[PDB]
């Protein structure tokens, strides 16, 4: 039915170092897209450092206890049966 | 006046044959810079009847490659330019079976 597309490009929300940080975006598609994240071409492994979640068309990566080591180019990949959509965001803590 | 800057463009991206590819990249610069997508020294032209499409706003560029074919694989260069300077960045698009 529809290839994935970003309604909102990935945007970072930072409070401070030591507090959680969120890279979030709005993605549409039919079938609904699968979202994957990669920091500096290295894929994000969910767990202690990162947490992935999605409320409807809102997809969000949470970086727990933000550190200077979390700085880098994060690439969001929305994939489905029809296509792929890529968009990136540079995080500088 | 403000010189242009490519915000964040992926280094490498991969897609399977026959699918649609979308690469959205944000940019800065006043006056609004000339967006130029190129591959192997050849400028990508947004052909309405073709497979390749480029959707440009005042702050965002989007590369569209419909029904991706093996030949489309390569090193794509996004290049902005205005009265006050220029910036370039590369995305290595890979094609798979
Ligand atoms: Cl990829």
PDB file of C-alpha atoms and ligand atoms in Angstrom:
ATOM      1  CA  UNK A   1       0.000   0.000   0.000  1.00  0.00           C
ATOM      2  CA  UNK A   2       2.656   2.705   1.018  1.00  0.00           C
ATOM      3  CA  UNK A   3       6.486   3.000   1.255  1.00  0.00           C
ATOM      4  CA  UNK A   4       7.880   4.429   4.584  1.00  0.00           C
ATOM      5  CA  UNK A   5       8.319   8.199   4.941  1.00  0.00           C
ATOM      6  CA  UNK A   6       9.342  10.538   7.747  1.00  0.00           C
ATOM      7  CA  UNK A   7       6.655  13.076   8.753  1.00  0.00           C
ATOM      8  CA  UNK A   8       9.155  14.462  11.298  1.00  0.00           C
ATOM      9  CA  UNK A   9      12.922  13.956  10.884  1.00  0.00           C
ATOM     10  CA  UNK A  10      14.711  12.408  13.972  1.00  0.00           C
ATOM     11  CA  UNK A  11      15.004  15.128  16.633  1.00  0.00           C
ATOM     12  CA  UNK A  12      16.992  14.826  19.858  1.00  0.00           C
ATOM     13  CA  UNK A  13      15.737  15.929  23.291  1.00  0.00           C
ATOM     14  CA  UNK A  14      18.469  16.378  25.901  1.00  0.00           C
ATOM     15  CA  UNK A  15      17.996  17.659  29.457  1.00  0.00           C
ATOM     16  CA  UNK A  16      21.609  17.184  30.691  1.00  0.00           C
ATOM     17  CA  UNK A  17      24.349  14.557  31.033  1.00  0.00           C
ATOM     18  CA  UNK A  18      23.271  11.814  33.480  1.00  0.00           C
ATOM     19  CA  UNK A  19      19.597  12.340  32.584  1.00  0.00           C
ATOM     20  CA  UNK A  20      17.757  10.344  29.849  1.00  0.00           C
ATOM     21  CA  UNK A  21      17.836  11.607  26.224  1.00  0.00           C
ATOM     22  CA  UNK A  22      15.452  10.864  23.352  1.00  0.00           C
ATOM     23  CA  UNK A  23      15.834  10.710  19.587  1.00  0.00           C
ATOM     24  CA  UNK A  24      12.217  10.715  18.289  1.00  0.00           C
ATOM     25  CA  UNK A  25      10.415  10.954  14.912  1.00  0.00           C
ATOM     26  CA  UNK A  26       7.059  10.473  13.156  1.00  0.00           C
ATOM     27  CA  UNK A  27       7.015   7.660  10.516  1.00  0.00           C
ATOM     28  CA  UNK A  28       4.146   6.532   8.291  1.00  0.00           C
ATOM     29  CA  UNK A  29       3.789   3.561   5.913  1.00  0.00           C
ATOM     30  CA  UNK A  30       1.525   0.686   4.879  1.00  0.00           C
ATOM     31  CA  UNK A  31       2.433  -1.966   6.129  1.00  0.00           C
ATOM     32  CA  UNK A  32       3.520   0.016   9.210  1.00  0.00           C
ATOM     33  CA  UNK A  33       7.326   0.313   9.168  1.00  0.00           C
ATOM     34  CA  UNK A  34       9.932  -1.492  11.309  1.00  0.00           C
ATOM     35  CA  UNK A  35      12.363   0.997  12.862  1.00  0.00           C
ATOM     36  CA  UNK A  36      16.049   0.301  13.462  1.00  0.00           C
ATOM     37  CA  UNK A  37      18.741   2.678  14.804  1.00  0.00           C
ATOM     38  CA  UNK A  38      22.526   2.849  14.302  1.00  0.00           C
ATOM     39  CA  UNK A  39      25.130   5.070  16.033  1.00  0.00           C
ATOM     40  CA  UNK A  40      28.140   5.703  13.713  1.00  0.00           C
ATOM     41  CA  UNK A  41      27.290   2.708  11.426  1.00  0.00           C
ATOM     42  CA  UNK A  42      27.198   0.409  14.546  1.00  0.00           C
ATOM     43  CA  UNK A  43      23.646  -0.903  15.280  1.00  0.00           C
ATOM     44  CA  UNK A  44      21.920  -0.026  18.544  1.00  0.00           C
ATOM     45  CA  UNK A  45      21.558  -2.976  20.958  1.00  0.00           C
ATOM     46  CA  UNK A  46      18.536  -2.389  23.246  1.00  0.00           C
ATOM     47  CA  UNK A  47      19.087  -2.872  26.978  1.00  0.00           C
ATOM     48  CA  UNK A  48      21.117  -0.914  29.511  1.00  0.00           C
ATOM     49  CA  UNK A  49      22.279   2.010  27.294  1.00  0.00           C
ATOM     50  CA  UNK A  50      19.296   2.195  24.903  1.00  0.00           C
ATOM     51  CA  UNK A  51      15.531   1.562  24.870  1.00  0.00           C
ATOM     52  CA  UNK A  52      13.233   1.472  21.835  1.00  0.00           C
ATOM     53  CA  UNK A  53       9.465   2.293  21.918  1.00  0.00           C
ATOM     54  CA  UNK A  54       6.637   3.429  19.591  1.00  0.00           C
ATOM     55  CA  UNK A  55       3.205   5.050  20.228  1.00  0.00           C
ATOM     56  CA  UNK A  56       1.349   4.854  16.918  1.00  0.00           C
ATOM     57  CA  UNK A  57       3.324   6.631  14.176  1.00  0.00           C
ATOM     58  CA  UNK A  58       5.747   8.024  16.838  1.00  0.00           C
ATOM     59  CA  UNK A  59       9.012   6.043  17.094  1.00  0.00           C
ATOM     60  CA  UNK A  60      11.457   6.800  19.951  1.00  0.00           C
ATOM     61  CA  UNK A  61      14.959   5.736  21.017  1.00  0.00           C
ATOM     62  CA  UNK A  62      15.785   6.564  24.632  1.00  0.00           C
ATOM     63  CA  UNK A  63      19.450   6.865  25.669  1.00  0.00           C
ATOM     64  CA  UNK A  64      19.536   6.155  29.456  1.00  0.00           C
ATOM     65  CA  UNK A  65      21.971   8.142  31.700  1.00  0.00           C
ATOM     66  CA  UNK A  66      23.374  10.313  28.848  1.00  0.00           C
ATOM     67  CA  UNK A  67      27.194  10.430  28.737  1.00  0.00           C
ATOM     68  CA  UNK A  68      29.659  12.251  26.474  1.00  0.00           C
ATOM     69  CA  UNK A  69      30.335   8.822  24.859  1.00  0.00           C
ATOM     70  CA  UNK A  70      26.773   8.862  23.413  1.00  0.00           C
ATOM     71  CA  UNK A  71      27.762  11.665  20.934  1.00  0.00           C
ATOM     72  CA  UNK A  72      27.645  10.601  17.268  1.00  0.00           C
ATOM     73  CA  UNK A  73      25.618  10.350  14.052  1.00  0.00           C
ATOM     74  CA  UNK A  74      22.467   8.314  14.720  1.00  0.00           C
ATOM     75  CA  UNK A  75      20.726   6.896  11.641  1.00  0.00           C
ATOM     76  CA  UNK A  76      17.044   5.898  11.756  1.00  0.00           C
ATOM     77  CA  UNK A  77      15.865   3.247   9.251  1.00  0.00           C
ATOM     78  CA  UNK A  78      12.163   2.769   8.521  1.00  0.00           C
ATOM     79  CA  UNK A  79      11.682  -0.438   6.555  1.00  0.00           C
ATOM     80  CA  UNK A  80       8.674  -2.314   5.151  1.00  0.00           C
ATOM     81  CA  UNK A  81       7.600  -4.691   2.312  1.00  0.00           C
ATOM     82  CA  UNK A  82       7.420  -1.697  -0.142  1.00  0.00           C
ATOM     83  CA  UNK A  83      10.595   0.204   0.779  1.00  0.00           C
ATOM     84  CA  UNK A  84      13.108   1.899   3.070  1.00  0.00           C
ATOM     85  CA  UNK A  85      13.385   5.435   4.435  1.00  0.00           C
ATOM     86  CA  UNK A  86      16.523   6.804   6.040  1.00  0.00           C
ATOM     87  CA  UNK A  87      17.069   9.984   8.042  1.00  0.00           C
ATOM     88  CA  UNK A  88      19.874  10.903  10.438  1.00  0.00           C
ATOM     89  CA  UNK A  89      20.512  13.091  13.503  1.00  0.00           C
ATOM     90  CA  UNK A  90      23.803  14.208  15.041  1.00  0.00           C
ATOM     91  CA  UNK A  91      23.856  14.082  18.843  1.00  0.00           C
ATOM     92  CA  UNK A  92      26.514  16.250  20.533  1.00  0.00           C
ATOM     93  CA  UNK A  93      26.604  16.032  24.349  1.00  0.00           C
TER      94      UNK A  93
ATOM     95  CA  UNK B   1      24.549  35.851   5.430  1.00  0.00           C
ATOM     96  CA  UNK B   2      24.967  32.150   6.406  1.00  0.00           C
ATOM     97  CA  UNK B   3      27.183  29.511   4.617  1.00  0.00           C
ATOM     98  CA  UNK B   4      25.506  26.102   4.002  1.00  0.00           C
ATOM     99  CA  UNK B   5      25.957  22.995   6.182  1.00  0.00           C
ATOM    100  CA  UNK B   6      24.733  19.396   5.648  1.00  0.00           C
ATOM    101  CA  UNK B   7      23.124  18.481   9.008  1.00  0.00           C
ATOM    102  CA  UNK B   8      23.318  14.644   8.994  1.00  0.00           C
ATOM    103  CA  UNK B   9      23.505  12.254   6.043  1.00  0.00           C
ATOM    104  CA  UNK B  10      24.134   8.478   6.529  1.00  0.00           C
ATOM    105  CA  UNK B  11      27.581   7.068   5.566  1.00  0.00           C
ATOM    106  CA  UNK B  12      26.268   3.722   4.129  1.00  0.00           C
ATOM    107  CA  UNK B  13      22.710   2.547   3.397  1.00  0.00           C
ATOM    108  CA  UNK B  14      21.520  -0.765   1.905  1.00  0.00           C
ATOM    109  CA  UNK B  15      18.295  -1.727   0.086  1.00  0.00           C
ATOM    110  CA  UNK B  16      16.930  -4.758  -1.827  1.00  0.00           C
ATOM    111  CA  UNK B  17      16.195  -4.688  -5.622  1.00  0.00           C
ATOM    112  CA  UNK B  18      12.707  -3.467  -6.622  1.00  0.00           C
ATOM    113  CA  UNK B  19      11.975  -1.503  -3.435  1.00  0.00           C
ATOM    114  CA  UNK B  20      11.696   2.332  -3.022  1.00  0.00           C
ATOM    115  CA  UNK B  21      14.585   4.208  -1.377  1.00  0.00           C
ATOM    116  CA  UNK B  22      14.227   7.461   0.603  1.00  0.00           C
ATOM    117  CA  UNK B  23      17.142   9.517   1.964  1.00  0.00           C
ATOM    118  CA  UNK B  24      16.061  12.598   3.906  1.00  0.00           C
ATOM    119  CA  UNK B  25      18.705  15.136   4.836  1.00  0.00           C
ATOM    120  CA  UNK B  26      18.331  18.511   6.586  1.00  0.00           C
ATOM    121  CA  UNK B  27      20.485  21.598   5.829  1.00  0.00           C
ATOM    122  CA  UNK B  28      21.256  25.180   6.937  1.00  0.00           C
ATOM    123  CA  UNK B  29      22.181  28.300   4.921  1.00  0.00           C
ATOM    124  CA  UNK B  30      20.837  31.767   4.038  1.00  0.00           C
ATOM    125  CA  UNK B  31      20.148  32.449   1.158  1.00  0.00           C
ATOM    126  CA  UNK B  32      18.706  28.921   0.633  1.00  0.00           C
ATOM    127  CA  UNK B  33      21.522  26.865  -1.024  1.00  0.00           C
ATOM    128  CA  UNK B  34      21.403  25.055  -4.389  1.00  0.00           C
ATOM    129  CA  UNK B  35      20.850  21.354  -3.650  1.00  0.00           C
ATOM    130  CA  UNK B  36      22.834  19.095  -6.051  1.00  0.00           C
ATOM    131  CA  UNK B  37      22.682  15.277  -5.809  1.00  0.00           C
ATOM    132  CA  UNK B  38      25.328  13.500  -7.905  1.00  0.00           C
ATOM    133  CA  UNK B  39      26.719  10.013  -8.506  1.00  0.00           C
ATOM    134  CA  UNK B  40      30.028   9.308 -10.235  1.00  0.00           C
ATOM    135  CA  UNK B  41      30.356  12.967 -11.259  1.00  0.00           C
ATOM    136  CA  UNK B  42      26.904  12.916 -12.971  1.00  0.00           C
ATOM    137  CA  UNK B  43      24.117  15.160 -11.551  1.00  0.00           C
ATOM    138  CA  UNK B  44      20.868  13.351 -10.585  1.00  0.00           C
ATOM    139  CA  UNK B  45      17.938  15.074 -12.361  1.00  0.00           C
ATOM    140  CA  UNK B  46      14.442  14.884 -10.804  1.00  0.00           C
ATOM    141  CA  UNK B  47      12.695  13.269 -13.814  1.00  0.00           C
ATOM    142  CA  UNK B  48       8.880  13.109 -13.340  1.00  0.00           C
ATOM    143  CA  UNK B  49       8.519   9.998 -15.590  1.00  0.00           C
ATOM    144  CA  UNK B  50      11.805   8.422 -14.393  1.00  0.00           C
ATOM    145  CA  UNK B  51      12.776   6.397 -11.305  1.00  0.00           C
ATOM    146  CA  UNK B  52      14.869   9.149  -9.613  1.00  0.00           C
ATOM    147  CA  UNK B  53      13.113  12.039  -7.769  1.00  0.00           C
ATOM    148  CA  UNK B  54      14.482  14.884  -5.603  1.00  0.00           C
ATOM    149  CA  UNK B  55      12.075  16.675  -3.205  1.00  0.00           C
ATOM    150  CA  UNK B  56      13.646  19.927  -1.916  1.00  0.00           C
ATOM    151  CA  UNK B  57      12.364  22.394   0.734  1.00  0.00           C
ATOM    152  CA  UNK B  58      14.040  25.486   2.299  1.00  0.00           C
ATOM    153  CA  UNK B  59      15.660  23.246   5.009  1.00  0.00           C
ATOM    154  CA  UNK B  60      15.408  19.627   3.702  1.00  0.00           C
ATOM    155  CA  UNK B  61      16.416  17.464   0.699  1.00  0.00           C
ATOM    156  CA  UNK B  62      14.927  14.035  -0.092  1.00  0.00           C
ATOM    157  CA  UNK B  63      16.410  11.564  -2.595  1.00  0.00           C
ATOM    158  CA  UNK B  64      13.887   9.065  -4.045  1.00  0.00           C
ATOM    159  CA  UNK B  65      14.969   5.991  -6.043  1.00  0.00           C
ATOM    160  CA  UNK B  66      11.939   3.956  -7.092  1.00  0.00           C
ATOM    161  CA  UNK B  67      12.161   0.244  -8.171  1.00  0.00           C
ATOM    162  CA  UNK B  68      15.857   0.129  -7.147  1.00  0.00           C
ATOM    163  CA  UNK B  69      18.092  -1.738  -9.649  1.00  0.00           C
ATOM    164  CA  UNK B  70      21.667  -3.111  -9.132  1.00  0.00           C
ATOM    165  CA  UNK B  71      23.178  -0.308 -11.358  1.00  0.00           C
ATOM    166  CA  UNK B  72      21.887   2.382  -8.879  1.00  0.00           C
ATOM    167  CA  UNK B  73      24.421   1.141  -6.296  1.00  0.00           C
ATOM    168  CA  UNK B  74      27.213   3.646  -5.731  1.00  0.00           C
ATOM    169  CA  UNK B  75      28.614   6.690  -3.941  1.00  0.00           C
ATOM    170  CA  UNK B  76      26.035   9.500  -3.958  1.00  0.00           C
ATOM    171  CA  UNK B  77      27.196  13.056  -3.163  1.00  0.00           C
ATOM    172  CA  UNK B  78      24.822  15.685  -1.744  1.00  0.00           C
ATOM    173  CA  UNK B  79      26.266  19.168  -2.398  1.00  0.00           C
ATOM    174  CA  UNK B  80      24.922  22.538  -1.181  1.00  0.00           C
ATOM    175  CA  UNK B  81      26.178  25.930  -2.311  1.00  0.00           C
ATOM    176  CA  UNK B  82      25.226  29.574  -1.921  1.00  0.00           C
ATOM    177  CA  UNK B  83      26.778  33.080  -2.146  1.00  0.00           C
ATOM    178  CA  UNK B  84      28.708  32.499   1.191  1.00  0.00           C
ATOM    179  CA  UNK B  85      30.177  28.983   0.724  1.00  0.00           C
ATOM    180  CA  UNK B  86      29.526  25.256   0.162  1.00  0.00           C
ATOM    181  CA  UNK B  87      29.287  21.803   1.820  1.00  0.00           C
ATOM    182  CA  UNK B  88      29.349  18.216   0.472  1.00  0.00           C
ATOM    183  CA  UNK B  89      28.620  14.776   1.990  1.00  0.00           C
ATOM    184  CA  UNK B  90      28.547  11.193   0.664  1.00  0.00           C
ATOM    185  CA  UNK B  91      26.117   8.272   1.065  1.00  0.00           C
ATOM    186  CA  UNK B  92      27.228   4.848  -0.133  1.00  0.00           C
ATOM    187  CA  UNK B  93      24.054   3.151  -1.452  1.00  0.00           C
ATOM    188  CA  UNK B  94      24.340  -0.679  -1.597  1.00  0.00           C
ATOM    189  CA  UNK B  95      21.993  -2.982  -3.511  1.00  0.00           C
ATOM    190  CA  UNK B  96      21.169  -6.592  -2.443  1.00  0.00           C
ATOM    191  CA  UNK B  97      19.287  -9.580  -4.099  1.00  0.00           C
TER     192      UNK B  97
HETATM  193 CL1  LIG C   1      21.354   0.210   6.045  1.00  0.00          CL
END
